[PDB]
């Protein structure tokens, strides 16, 4: 919401309250998953052609007791300050999306799953800290439609080993026409010491690329996704060296507020130490969402897991259900 | 405060900061106590008969440290979604109050102390995660004054035994007019495999209930509490067998801001294991808290101990005095 | 930003994103420095001697990870409630700054270095818990232009002992006519049990004061700060038994947004425990900083330390800069 507006500067504050429950015959993925958002974001006009702007925003567990688990899950999502130069770009820097994320969020669009390869602290495929970004919208006022951009990552040494980075650098490029959309994206970095003496995973090199194409238009969205990772894709020992990831969705919006969505995921891992091959993504997904206006909604999602029992890396291949219900403002 | 109300949204966001000093003998209650309270709550109209709404509440400590303690103590008290659909009653699910809180409060006016029986974490008596709660106020526009609701909770299986649960039920009721009131509550649900290997208390069920009246009007308040717990009464080193809770105070409201305070807090514990019945609440209580405004306030609250020396559950049975300055907005 | 102005009751949100970078060959102070800032701010009016307010403020660092070190360096910086009495002074009582602050505070404009003996929970020289402040301006309206404040300090018994403190009191006075200023201020506290037992600092009382001047008007400004502590500098392992402070900074403010900066700290630490004299601080500091506008900035600092490679005290003796980008609100 904008809660102010005056000589020059907007403030949004933001937020939402998830009552959320899942169903499910695992452990880790069944009972209570409520959850709220906090944030703000704003921006100043310096002179015609240029405007400062910043944005933070939160997670609030709300399925944690008040003793000594009252923080598990709790945590800063985004951190950044920049500059807008009218034609010529944009320039920020801080906690942020990486521009693998570009390509990788046309299919991350389901009611509660989905976006399985998009993750946070994990280089350029999700949110990260360190991360310095120039996007040019529109080509200089040229060629419209046409949008790029070209980021460097800063070193991060974490206690986390998996949540670690060197030194990396990405780009990205998207166009769109009549509804029809098409994107690329790639990204490479170093490795950190602590991350080559892990049980999975070999190379002094990240990497991550992906593209896809879509349709958006006239209550209608379609899109399908490919890209690969190499000693990148975050698994529970270590990295795969290699993965080849896939996924599609379809979604059609009813004028009375009913969006149905379904969709198909696979992600194959290659050459783990003494694993070999296997699936470590695999599920069909068939849900809706309801919206009543703006601010509220509800939602049911289906996850129909076909992983096998014998998985070979030890992931758990059962189904869940997902039923939301989301306060927003 | 009302800090949005556009094309039928609203969003209030509140808060306070307590200043807060104990002085005791006590040494777990003498320090500063120092605190302050944010959160929001938000109302959006869908139609004429469904109106959605959203609430999350936050306990930030102000005794602590900036280093390693700076968490102690901090944590989300509320955070819920629902829909209100006209007469024909409310539903919101999240963390939020179990029903048999609904009698419990009716004597946690004081202003410091009181509302011992009803606590976080604990079946239905307080605030609690996981909670699908239905509310009718006036009886579907039949009878005015009249409130009734059903609740039920979700298992929470968390490391910490004394603040989990199984699933369970609750239901309570309540009626006004002309200054008086009258309310009960009921609660039953099953505790997990861990709260069954504790010293104190054997069980397979937990229940709580209490009922109460009030008086409340011409600047007068008056009430008086009573219920029983059995297997869910909160110790030191587990749950009581059974319980009986007595509470009752008087207050009045003079015109000039002040309000004086006096109460009385008795709870019987039955049959502990290796200790027979005992006393776990006895207090005698003295105050007074004076209004400037209605966002401006101080108080002093006097606790009178009568638990005895070198007691069998080891409770503490010092004195307590509090006194509070209290910006809120 | 002040977002709420209502029937004598006023409330102001704020905040700032700050993306933050070091540069510098010590590892501890070298990548991403990024983090946000959140607070509420508020007044009300209660009669024409009387106006009520309180104040809180948190830290939410931007360059950790979104796993198990999320909640590291995060805390709350004030808490506190208060009355302001029309011309006969202030009082408040929380988590707010300690008066020899007033002093150390006038030569604590740089960019992003300096300030560096005036740190949080250490008695009176920053931020603290637990203190009733009582201040008053321009001297009851009869001697303009002369403030004085008189403190008092409760006991903090932490598990950290250099976070801790026992009882206290502490003085401020300051004068200010045609552009110049003059200020001194002292306090004095008790040591806690396990303070008195640590590898540096003895005695079981604990002492501050420093003492000041500065120009400030017509796009200048010059200060110079001198003071000495006395079991109460916080060092790696413990408290140096004296201390001597030195700083001193100039700045000019250009039209057209750009404010130059140059400054000088020193400060020595005596007599400690196997160690005798050595210095802890002493760095040479030119930096700028360019201000788009009263929302949004950008700074460069540089810190030329000149502390030697064989320190005594081990203390780091590397260069550093921080390059910075602010948007506030
Ligand atoms: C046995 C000691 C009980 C604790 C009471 C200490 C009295 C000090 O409080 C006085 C401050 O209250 C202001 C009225
Ligand atoms: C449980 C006692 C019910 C109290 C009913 C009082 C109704 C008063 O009359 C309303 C006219
Ligand atoms: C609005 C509340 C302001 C209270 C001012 C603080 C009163 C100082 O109180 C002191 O602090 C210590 C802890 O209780 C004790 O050891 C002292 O006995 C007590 O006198």
Redesign the interface.
């Known amino acids: 919401?904008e809660?102010?507006n005056?000589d020059?500067?907007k403030?949004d504050?933001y937020?939402?309250?998830?009552?959320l429950?899942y169903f499910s015959d695992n452990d880790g993925n069944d009972?209570?998953k409520?959850?709220?958002r906090?944030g703000?974001k704003?921006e100043?006009k310096?002179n015609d052609q240029?405007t400062?702007?910043?944005?933070?925003e939160?997670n609030?567990?709300?399925?944690?007791?008040?003793?000594?688990?009252?923080?598990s899950g709790?945590?800063?999502?985004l951190?950044?300050?920049?500059?807008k130069f009218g034609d010529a770009g944009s320039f920020?820097?801080?906690?942020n999306y990486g521009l693998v994320y570009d390509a990788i969020g046309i299919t991350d669009m389901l009611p509660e799953f989905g976006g399985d390869t998009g993750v946070?602290?994990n280089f350029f495929s999700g949110?990260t800290?360190?991360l310095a970004t120039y996007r040019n919208s529109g080509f200089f006022g040229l060629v419209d439609g046409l949008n790029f951009g070209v980021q460097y990552l800063?070193?991060?040494?974490?206690?986390?080993a998996?949540?670690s980075n060197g030194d990396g650098w990405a780009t990205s490029l998207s166009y769109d026409f009549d509804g029809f959309g098409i994107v690329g994206a790639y990204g490479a970095a170093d490795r950190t010491n602590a991350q080559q003496n892990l049980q999975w995973g070999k190379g002094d090199k990240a990497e991550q690329w992906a593209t896809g194409l879509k349709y958006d238009a006239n209550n209608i969205y379609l899109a399908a996704l490919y890209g690969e990772m190499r000693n990148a894709a975050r698994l529970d020992n270590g990295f795969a060296n290699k993965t080849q990831d896939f996924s599609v969705v379809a979604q059609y919006q009813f004028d009375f507020g009913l969006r149905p969505s379904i969709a198909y995921y696979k992600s194959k891992a290659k050459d783990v130490e003494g694993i070999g091959d296997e699936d470590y993504i695999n599920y069909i997904d068939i849900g809706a969402t309801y919206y009543?206006?703006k601010?509220?909604s509800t939602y049911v999602d289906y996850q129909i897991n076909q992983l096998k029992d014998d998985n070979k890396l030890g992931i758990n291949n059962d189904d869940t259900v997902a039923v939301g219900?989301?306060?927003?403002?």
């Open positions: 919401a809660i102010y005056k020059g500067n403030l504050l937020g939402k309250a998830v009552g429950h009972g209570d409520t959850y709220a906090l703000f704003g100043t310096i240029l400062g702007y910043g944005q933070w939160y609030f567990q709300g399925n944690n007791s008040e003793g000594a688990d009252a923080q709790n945590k800063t999502r951190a950044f300050a920049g500059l920020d820097y801080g906690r946070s602290d949110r800290g360190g800063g070193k991060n040494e974490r206690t986390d998996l949540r009543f206006n601010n509220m219900l989301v306060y927003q403002f």
